[PDB]
Amino acid sequence: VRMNVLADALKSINNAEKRGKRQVLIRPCSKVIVRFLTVMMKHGYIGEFEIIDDHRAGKIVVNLTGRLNKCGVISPRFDVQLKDLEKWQNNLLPSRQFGFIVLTTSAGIMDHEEARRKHTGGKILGFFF
């Protein structure tokens, strides 16, 4: 059965990007998916997006610009502390110059570079580059 909705959303975008398609449809929608998409959009990796109401959790249509190399999920939501975050970005990123880990923290869902300014740890959700 469907054990996790965020893993479907990112796998669906990742297969559409590799085929060269200009749009994709995500279903079911969730509060976690809308907040994750917003972090990719603010850094310039995807275009703007629209939500459809249907009285059953809803759907999203997203616009693609061709810049995204990958996006992905870490399935157990492991806890991270500021001293251990260096080991995770050494494992998951392609260079020290670009790409982002996404964390959930009591100050909100955010970019791993913002978590250092806000002096906060959290749980891992995923990444993009």
């Binding site: 917003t38 959009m41 997006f49 629209e50 939500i51 459809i52 109401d53």
Partner: protein, 190 residues
């Protein structure tokens, strides 16, 4: 009695006593005497709209509103005839209760009903404004700056009852909730 609007200390205002006088005097002619019965209006306000003109909002208590809507098609037509070129809307006197989890006092002895949530109140206020017509569907657009716009679809029958008021609906819903809305008609509907 007259001056039916608002709780104690707030009541004497000229505009709001004026609109509630204009409502309660209308039961005195024989046609609306059949169907008005001094039923409560809780408040009224006069507010600016995007064309530089004015519109009025009338606030109705929840167990009375199911009776107001049954006569609103004549009662608002009489008020929009009598006032100086204004547009009118009736809306419910809904209350919002605060979030129990770490944003309010909370205990086992009473539970917050989901009918008193902010989401269930703001999406009910949207249905009151459009009343002569019915909502066919909603969509929400997220912009590159992180802002939102709502797109509302209205039924294709009864266009003649709302097309001249979409410009007041956007300004009224903005001032009741803080959010941008556009009102539109569908290409086709199943």
């Amino acid at each position: 009695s007259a001056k039916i609007v608002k709780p104690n200390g707030e009541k004497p205002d000229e505009f709001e006593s004026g609109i509630s006088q204009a409502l309660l005097e209308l039961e005195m002619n024989s046609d609306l005497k059949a169907q008005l019965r001094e039923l409560n209006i809780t408040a009224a306000k006069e507010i600016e709209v995007g064309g530089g003109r004015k519109a009025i909002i009338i606030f109705v208590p929840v167990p009375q509103l199911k009776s107001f809507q049954k006569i609103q098609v004549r009662l608002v037509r009489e008020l929009e005839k009598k006032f100086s070129g204004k547009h009118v809307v009736f809306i419910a006197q809904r209350r919002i209760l605060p979030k129990p989890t770490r944003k309010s006092r909370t205990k086992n002895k009473q539970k917050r009903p989901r009918s008193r949530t902010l989401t269930a109140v703001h999406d009910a206020i949207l249905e009151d404004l459009v009343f002569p017509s019915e909502i066919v569907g909603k969509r929400i657009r997220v912009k590159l700056d992180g802002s939102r716009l709502i797109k509302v679809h209205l039924d294709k029958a009864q266009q003649n009852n709302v097309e001249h008021k979409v410009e007041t609906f956007s300004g009224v819903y903005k001032k009741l909730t803080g959010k941008d809305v556009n009102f539109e008609f569908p290409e086709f509907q199943l």
